Structures are given as structure tokens and as C-alpha cells.
Amino acid sequence: HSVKLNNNYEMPIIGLGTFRKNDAYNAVKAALEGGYRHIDTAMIYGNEEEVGRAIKDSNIPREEIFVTTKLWNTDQGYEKTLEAFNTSLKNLGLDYIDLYLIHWFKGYDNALSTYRAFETLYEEGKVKAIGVSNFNVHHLMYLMENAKIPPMVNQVETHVTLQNHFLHDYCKKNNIQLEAYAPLMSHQIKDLLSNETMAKIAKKHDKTIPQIAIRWLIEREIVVIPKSITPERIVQNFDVFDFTLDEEDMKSIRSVNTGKKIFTEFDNVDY
Amino acid sequence: HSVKLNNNYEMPIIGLGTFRSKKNDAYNAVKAALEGGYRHIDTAMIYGNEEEVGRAIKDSNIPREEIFVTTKLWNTDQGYEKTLEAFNTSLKNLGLDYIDLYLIHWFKGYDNALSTYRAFETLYEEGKVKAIGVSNFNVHHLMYLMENAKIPPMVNQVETHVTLQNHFLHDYCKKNNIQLEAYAPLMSHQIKDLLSNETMAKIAKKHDKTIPQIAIRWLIEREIVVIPKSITPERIVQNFDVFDFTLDEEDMKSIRSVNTGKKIFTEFDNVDY
Fold first, then answer.
1. Does CATH number 3.40.50.970 belong to domain B1-273?
2. Which one of A116, A176, A242, B213 is most buried, by most CB atoms within 10 A?
3. Which A residues 90-149 touch B at CB under 8 Å?
């Protein structure tokens, strides 16, 4: 399953996430042979070194695999972004990264000067798609109005208890592809796993609750990067293209939303 | 001490917070506060204590115009015609026939916000509300109101405490002449993280105060209206004893670091209720 960005570049709707040794190598290599075409990392994770090797060791040609990495907050600013990218580039062992994102919002000025470097790199052909992460509406509005190459991706915490329909509709309207991280509610997964609504629907389609949660995002045309290093759940998280959810399912999952955000508030970041 | 909203209307920088509790616990708390020196009471229709709050104000033998009363409009009543009626219900329950401050409790879409606020504006012109504002509104929600309102928002009541300091939202409001108001200043049901905070516990040694008294003063120093909720008479008095000391620069910079950004209550744009 592919999805078209506003620059007409296709992006795998399912991808492997990565987290902060050798475990990173375990996950990517197992994922690539499992069917994954999409790997999501960042400098802050500190696994870019590992992530890249795992993209060589099993020869699936480079242009068949979507690679995403992010610029950390302390590296915001034009020139600092240029070399933090190169460092991230050399760590991954590539000279082109499919998607480059601003990891967090650190001010309007810092965003534009960072994104300014994103654009010059985009012209040079070093990146294929540019976007942001943990950006809210007013954050995106500034990008739309003051940047030349409009944002393509907004990677935010999105799951069954924080479904982000308002933010999703804004992105779609402004041709921004919303990407969901922590789709299994991260360290609050037990809330998901113990949810009665999800379990019911899981029993219905002969699938696991995380598979429904992942499939649910697919139904909303949202790119999902479920985050595991455990070899065979990486298997299961990818096994969500043999069934479909109906209206009643989407209707039921809709009511699971609580609006209880797990990760730090968009405008309250200090790191 | 009081701040003045953009319409020159004064508002006591501290006030009693009221939560949906049991019989006469809301009634007792209000008077226990009013006797303590409180001149600001914060309620809402969803709390279901407008009746007990309003009667506690009458029997206090304290002149009405010297008490700041804030109530809020609930999500289900958003919309011009429904807002006018929900306001009269609030007004009658409170046994008042003018309200100091009226707030939109949550964001439920731009159209619902503007339609509701138009009703607020009608009430303001009719002199039934002395000040109008919102609650749980983020930046882009405020931008819509700043653009479309004919009587600009005066107050934005949002979750604000030492772990969620909201400096960005605060700066935005100040630039647009909106008085930021802090609810859950003691981190509400997450009272433990605040009381266990080493930094908060230390600087409390310096001024011989309690940790809550500190968190309250810190908001006072930032010129933010604070409304700590309580039904325990003692802590109500303690939460008010906050005008006999000050916080220096190194204190403020020490409190600044204890920000984590972990928001306790519902995200601004994910309210289904």
C-alpha cells in the first residue's frame, strides 16, 4: 500500500519505527525481510549507525526502501541543520534520505531557518520529501504562509485514545500527509490491550488488538510506524493487508478516543 | 491583588476553585474562602454547584459587587440560542442577575465557538456579563476569535502549573491582550508530583511556606490569575496566604526548570464530550 505526497512522491503507509545496542540492527533486518519498505529513525535515537547497515546486509536495492530521519532540537538553525543532516547522512551510510523531519517545534524563527535548510537540501536532491514532527495547527499555518516548499508530512502521536480528527482534517485540507507515531500507545499499550471495544473487534477479524489499531490508521489513510524490536511482533504488525474494517468497526473505534495525550505538549518542549 | 482585563474590568488574581462534589461541601468551601479573604469564586454548569455557590454568596453578608463570580458554558450548550438559555439557567441557579466572567469551557469547532461567542457578546452588550472569555482554547482557536469577534476575548482559562508552564501560550495571550488564567495550579489529582518535587520542596524552605503556596505565588509572579480548588478549610486559608512574601529571580529560574510539558487534562483538539 502506497500513499502520494504533494510532491507526487510515494510513501509506504506502513513502516518500522526505531528507538534508542544491536537491537536496532535486529529490528530493521527482520523488518526488511518481512516485507517492510519503510524505516523511520532519528539522530536523537542514536541508532542511525545501526539502521543503515541493516539496509545493506540484505540486498533490497536502495530505491525500493523509504528512509526517514529527523533533525534534533539542539541542531535547529540553518547551518547547524546542514551538517546535522550530513552527520545523520554519513551515520546511515547513505547520501539520500527519503524523508527529513523537524523533530519538535522550537519557535517560529527556529522553524523557518531550519526549514530553510530543508528546502536548499531538497533542491540539491539529498532529500526526497520534507516535513515536520509534533507540529500543531498554528505551527503548520506558519509553515504554509512563510515557506516556499509546502510541508509534506506531519508526524504526530496518534492512536485510538488520541485520534486527532481535528488535526487530521487540517492536514488533509492543506495537503499534508499525517503520520502517526506511538500507534500502539507506546508505554501505555496496556490501556489499548485491555480495551474491551478493541478486543471485540479483534475477535471479529481473527486478528490481534494491535493489528486492528494499526489497520485502523490505514483505514483513515494515515501512515503508521508501529514501534517494536521483538522479531515476530514486527511480523504481526506488518500483517494487516489481508483484511478490512467496516463502518461499524470504525464507528466503534471512534468512541475509544479520550484525548489523553501521552507525549509532551506541542508548545512545552525545553529539550 | 487584582489584574485588569482589556476592558478595564478588575479581576482578583486569586480565587477559589470549585469542583463537582457532594452536598454542602461546595457551599461550605465558598464561605470558608469568603471569610478567609477570597473575593473571587470560579464555578461552572458542569460542576452542578451553581446553586450552592450562589447561596453561599448571599448568606456571607458581603456586598455582591465586591465578589468576582465566574461560571462557564458547557459543551452541549454551544450555539447562539442554546447559549443564551444556558446562561439564564446559570444566572438563576447562582441567584445573581449579572455575572462577572463567562467562559466557553471547551473548544468544539470554530463555528460553534463563534456562534457561542456571539451570544456572549449580546449578553455583554446587555450588561449581563462584565467580562467574556474562553477556556481550554489553544493558539489557533484564539486566532479565530481575535479575527472574528467584535468584542475581543478577555480571559483564557487553561491548565497551567509548574510541570506545564505554557510560556508560549502565555506570551501569545499577552501579545493579544488576553488574561491567561490557570486552573489545576496544584496539578489537580496529580497532586503527588508537585508535593514530591525536590525543587519545589527546597525553595519552600527559603520562604517558610508550603509547596502549594509556592506554586500559587509563582503564578502570581507571572501575572497569571490562579484558582486552586479545595474543600478543606485549612488548605483554603493556606492557599490564600500568598501575599506576605515574594519570589526572587533565582527562585523563578529554579522553578522554570521543573517544567516537563506533561499535560494532565484533555488535549485541546480531542474533545468528544
1. no
2. A176
3. 136-138, 141
